[PDB]
UniProtKB/Swiss-Prot annotation, chain A:
Keywords: Cytoplasm, Ribonucleoprotein, Ribosomal protein. This is Large ribosomal subunit protein eL15A. The gene is RPL15A. One of its GO terms (cellular component) is cytosolic large ribosomal subunit. Component of the large ribosomal subunit (LSU). Mature yeast ribosomes consist of a small (40S) and a large (60S) subunit. The 40S small subunit contains 1 molecule of ribosomal RNA (18S rRNA) and 33 different proteins (encoded by 57 genes). The large 60S subunit contains 3 rRNA molecules (25S, 5.8S and 5S rRNA) and 46 different proteins (encoded by 81 genes). The chain holds residues 2 to 102 of 204 of the full protein. The keyword Ribosomal protein applies. GO terms for molecular function: RNA binding; structural constituent of ribosome. There are 2 genes for eL15 in yeast. Belongs to the eukaryotic ribosomal protein eL15 family.
From Swiss-Prot, chain B:
This is Large ribosomal subunit protein uL2A. It is found in: Cytoplasm. Component of the ribosome, a large ribonucleoprotein complex responsible for the synthesis of proteins in the cell. The small ribosomal subunit (SSU) binds messenger RNAs (mRNAs) and translates the encoded message by selecting cognate aminoacyl-transfer RNA (tRNA) molecules. The large subunit (LSU) contains the ribosomal catalytic site termed the peptidyl transferase center (PTC), which catalyzes the formation of peptide bonds, thereby polymerizing the amino acids delivered by tRNAs into a polypeptide chain. PANTHER family: LARGE RIBOSOMAL SUBUNIT PROTEIN UL2 (PTHR13691:SF16), RIBOSOMAL PROTEIN L2 (PTHR13691). It comes from Saccharomyces cerevisiae (strain ATCC 204508 / S288c) (Baker's yeast). There is a cross-link at residues 45, 92, 118, 144 (Glycyl lysine isopeptide (Lys-Gly) (interchain with G-Cter in ubiquitin)). It holds the Pfam family Ribosomal_L2. The keyword Plastid does not apply. The modification Phosphoserine is found at residues 51, 94, 158-159. GO terms for molecular function: RNA binding; rRNA binding; structural constituent of ribosome. There are 2 genes for uL2 in yeast. The gene is RPL2A. GO terms for cellular component: cytosol; cytosolic large ribosomal subunit. GO terms for biological process: cytoplasmic translation; maintenance of translational fidelity; ribosomal large subunit biogenesis. SMART domains: Ribosomal_L2, Ribosomal_L2_C.
UniProtKB/Swiss-Prot annotation, chain C:
Component of the large ribosomal subunit (LSU). Mature yeast ribosomes consist of a small (40S) and a large (60S) subunit. The 40S small subunit contains 1 molecule of ribosomal RNA (18S rRNA) and 33 different proteins (encoded by 57 genes). The large 60S subunit contains 3 rRNA molecules (25S, 5.8S and 5S rRNA) and 46 different proteins (encoded by 81 genes). GO terms for biological process: cytoplasmic translation; maturation of LSU-rRNA. Present with 238000 molecules/cell in log phase SD medium. It comes from Saccharomyces cerevisiae (strain ATCC 204508 / S288c). This is Large ribosomal subunit protein eL8A. The keyword Cytoplasm applies. One of its GO terms (cellular component) is cytosolic large ribosomal subunit. Pfam families: Ribosomal_L7Ae (PF01248).
UniProtKB/Swiss-Prot annotation, chain D:
SUPFAM superfamilies: Ribosomal proteins S24e, L23 and L15e (SSF54189). PANTHER family: 60S RIBOSOMAL PROTEIN L23A. GO terms for molecular function: RNA binding; rRNA binding; structural constituent of ribosome. It comes from Saccharomyces cerevisiae (strain ATCC 204508 / S288c). GO terms for biological process: cytoplasmic translation; ribosomal large subunit assembly. Signal peptide: none annotated. Keywords: Cytoplasm, Isopeptide bond, Ribonucleoprotein, Ribosomal protein, RNA-binding, rRNA-binding, Ubl conjugation. GO terms for cellular component: cytosol; cytosolic large ribosomal subunit; preribosome, large subunit precursor. This is Large ribosomal subunit protein uL23. Pfam families: Ribosomal_L23 (PF00276), Ribosomal_L23eN (PF03939).
RNA sequence: UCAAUGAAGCGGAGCUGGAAUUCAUUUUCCACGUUCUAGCAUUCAAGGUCCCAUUCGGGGCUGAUCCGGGUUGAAGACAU
RNA sequence: AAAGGCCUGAUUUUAUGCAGGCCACCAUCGAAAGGGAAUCCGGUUAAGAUUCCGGAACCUGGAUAUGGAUUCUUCACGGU
């Protein structure tokens, strides 16, 4: 049951060893396509608890999404309306970057 | 207030360069193994008057050393460049009129034109007519070179960069005036959708920041900060010192 | 012969068209190849954390020989051989009434990480091998100290293909013998002792040592020149 | 150890064997019967006054035919239908959505002989 | 991060000729087939060489130094 | 961007092989006046015609056979 051990190393995220591995995939992930079938899970411990059972018929995609906030969809930020809603930046997305993915 | 004219210009909706007759991307031949060690010997088959560029194009023919073909390329014609004149270019190119040389090999105090900002850009300096750079410094230890630039600027340049020896032809291209509206009309028709430029004062105040008023007067200050934003920095921009020059 | 004539072709600067030398250095490798390549390059450029590069300090080929040799003796039994094995088992249990021990005690290499791990904290594993290039490496990084902290002899081994073929599978990323017969015991004891010479004694320094930082050909040569003249 | 020698800095797609379709079933499960046969392309000759005028002195017949009636199609169609060699076939699209075909008969076959056996003229 | 390229010759280690006092040894030392001409340069190059059985054809090696497989350059933890 | 479409030999549906292998190119649409493979004349209908009839032309593609050419000096000859 190494997944339990894999879990408790995964908790310690900013740890030096995972900081290294994080620094590996950040480079690796950008160059590959934004959407691409992951060959196999990178976190098998979390894989088997989120629903993935390593049998036929399951697939994994790896996705990247822009950070930051959702800007206004109006030209030149010309908000038309009462000054309560002038703001076109610092306007936050209701879902998380998860659901966007 | 509606959108000022210059603000519309950035949109590129209509003011795209009238590139119908432009002979091509007038630039220098890419840096290759031949030039990077020795030199190459091309020929100016013939020269054509480029559209919308006072400089004629020293259109040259180069032999491809890898596949048997004549890699066509265009040069900007220096002074004294003529058809049937062989062109030598490269770090081992003998310095002569109309020959491209890397700026490391050229000696101090030499006239050069059509210079690369950084190696690979295919030349971006002094391309205009009657303009030339002057090599006023050499800094071999850090592969740098100090030039007098046409705008009176003092650039430092990687010594690997290259420029073609000689001054761009068409000196005095601007001496006699257009002398008439249609003349400038023809000058601009071929190159820009930028003429006429109509004074902002005569505008109704919506059209331009300066416009409007019972008396046709600018009203507020002409000088406008760099820190100002699009739609405000039209007029006199960041004017370090207005008035007559040399005083 | 006055018809065979030597006309050397000048391929010098500005001369006749060059011949097609091998451009293998300049191939526009498909982007997947590239991104796959520099991954190894970045794997070595950066300061590698101590529990990484505990791999890539592995067994020699000669020692790996008898390692794979004795495992090949202890190859597990695939389901194909189980077909007749269950056939004679079912018959012997049914009419021979020989309880369930009609077959001898199976002696196979325990494999699969959760299975081998279970063998480890139970200290019932007599030898463990680890593939040194699992993707992601996270799967095994905890194993060496896990094995070391309770005295089970582990050995990092290069190439999951050898593990897969010794387990009739594709990959295993891990292997373990828990039972060895007496005749093979002496060879196993020789192997365990000589592996313990590799990792078990030195693990403390490896626990403290860093790694990575391998400068490339351009960088390392140039910094030698600065080192050479200064 | 040993490495190959390549010639192109550009790595084109490596040619690879292709397999043609091997369907378990036919997509339509049966070859559709002829969409356009002889009787399907030809509808009925027109005996308007002008066609009546044109037939004898022109050595030609007029053929109401489908929108899909191609000259290649119709030439063999009439040839196989009336057992008559055809010199050339002329066609047009009558403004009432009907493709009229001015079919012309060779020297041996004279329209009236082909016309009368039909039933009209 | 920027730029370019059909990502073509980059770096190192060499060979040849040069002036040096380790004399030549990369203890130095620079360049590695073209500068009177609107020509042409294309057949896995000719040669030389080795092998096959070679039929009346082919195939390897020097020619064309080799090692690193980082395409090259700039910049750089700034900037974005 | 890993974007192949033609090469051609296996024996005249012939390897879907290195083999007499190549730009390294990058889908397509956008003109009834831009460029464009080739037609004219006479007659002829109630209305059509460079389109129908007659006659004489030309072009594209295809397969395809005779004349003439050239060839024992293998793929022409006159003319400064």
């Amino acid at each position: 049951g190494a997944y339990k051990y894999l879990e408790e190393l995964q908790r310690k995220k900013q740890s030096d060893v995972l900081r290294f591995l994080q620094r590996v995939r950040v480079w690796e992930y950008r160059q590959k396509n934004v959407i691409h079938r992951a060959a196999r899970p990178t976190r098998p411990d979390k894989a088997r608890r989120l629903g993935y059972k390593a049998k036929q018929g399951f697939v994994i995609y790896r996705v990247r999404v822009r950070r930051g906030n959702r800007k206004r969809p109006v030209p030149k930020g010309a908000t038309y309306g009462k000054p309560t809603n002038q703001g076109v930046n610092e306007l936050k997305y209701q879902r998380s970057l998860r659901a966007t993915a | 207030g509606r959108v000022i004219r210059n603000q519309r210009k950035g949109a590129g909706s209509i003011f795209t360069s009238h590139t119908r007759l432009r002979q091509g991307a007038a630039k220098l031949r890419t840096l290759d193994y031949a030039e990077r060690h020795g030199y190459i010997r091309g020929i100016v088959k013939q020269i054509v008057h480029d559209s919308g560029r006072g400089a004629p194009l020293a259109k040259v023919v180069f032999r491809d050393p890898y596949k048997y073909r004549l890699r066509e390329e265009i040069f900007i014609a220096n002074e004294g460049v003529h058809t049937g004149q062989f062109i030598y270019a490269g770090k081992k190119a003998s310095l002569n009129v109309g020959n491209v040389l890397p700026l490391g090999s050229v000696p101090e105090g030499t006239i050069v034109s059509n210079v690369e900002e950084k190696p690979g850009d295919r030349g971006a300096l002094a391309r205009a007519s009657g303009n030339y750079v002057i090599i006023i410094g050499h800094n071999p230890d850090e592969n740098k070179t100090r030039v007098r630039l046409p705008s009176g600027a003092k650039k430092v340049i990687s010594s690997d960069a290259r420029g073609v020896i000689g001054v761009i032809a068409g000196g005095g291209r601007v001496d006699k005036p257009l002398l008439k509206a249609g003349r400038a009309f023809h000058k601009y028709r071929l190159k820009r959708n930028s003429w006429p430029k109509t004074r902002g004062v005569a505008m109704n105040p919506v059209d331009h920041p300066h416009g409007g008023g019972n008396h046709q007067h600018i009203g507020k200050a002409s000088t406008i900060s760099r820190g100002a934003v699009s739609g405000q920095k039209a007029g006199l921009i960041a004017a370090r010192r207005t008035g007559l020059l040399r005083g | 012969n006055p018809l065979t004539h030597s006309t050397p072709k000048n391929f010098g600067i500005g001369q006749a068209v060059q011949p097609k030398r091998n451009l293998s250095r300049y191939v526009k490798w498909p982007e997947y190849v590239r991104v796959q390549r520099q991954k190894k390059i970045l794997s070595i450029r950066l300061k590698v954390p101590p529990t990484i590069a505990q791999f890539q300090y592995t067994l020699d080929r000669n020692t790996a020989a008898e390692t794979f040799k004795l495992f090949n003796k202890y190859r597990p039994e695939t389901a194909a051989e189980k077909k007749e094995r269950l056939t004679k088992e079912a018959a012997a249990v049914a009419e021979g009434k020989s309880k369930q021990d009609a077959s001898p005690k199976p002696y196979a290499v325990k494999y699969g990480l959760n299975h081998v791990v279970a063998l480890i904290e139970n200290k019932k594993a007599k030898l463990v091998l680890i593939a040194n290039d699992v993707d992601p490496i996270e799967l095994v990084v905890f194993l060496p100290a896990l094995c070391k902290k309770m005295g089970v002899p582990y050995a990092i081994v290069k190439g999951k293909a050898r593990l897969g073929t010794l387990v009739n599978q594709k990959t295993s990323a891990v292997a373990a013998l828990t039972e060895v017969r007496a005749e093979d015991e002496a060879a196993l004891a020789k192997l365990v002792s000589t592996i313990d010479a590799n990792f078990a004694d030195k693990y403390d320094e490896v626990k403290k040592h860093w790694g990575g930082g391998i400068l490339g050909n351009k960088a390392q040569a140039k910094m030698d020149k600065r080192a050479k003249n200064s | 150890k040993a490495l190959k020698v390549r010639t192109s800095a550009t790595f084109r797609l490596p040619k690879t064997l292709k397999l043609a379709r091997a369907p378990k079933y036919a997509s339509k499960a049966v070859p559709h019967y002829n969409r356009l046969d002889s009787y399907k392309v030809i509808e009925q000759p027109i005996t308007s006054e002008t066609a009546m005028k044109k037939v004898e002195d022109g050595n030609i017949l007029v053929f109401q035919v489908s929108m899909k009636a191609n000259k290649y199609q119709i030439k063999k169609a009439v040839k196989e239908l009336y057992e008559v060699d055809v010199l050339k076939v002329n066609t047009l699209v009558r403004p009432n959505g009907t493709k009229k075909a001015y079919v012309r008969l060779t020297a041996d076959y004279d329209a009236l002989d082909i016309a009368n056996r039909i039933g009209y003229i």
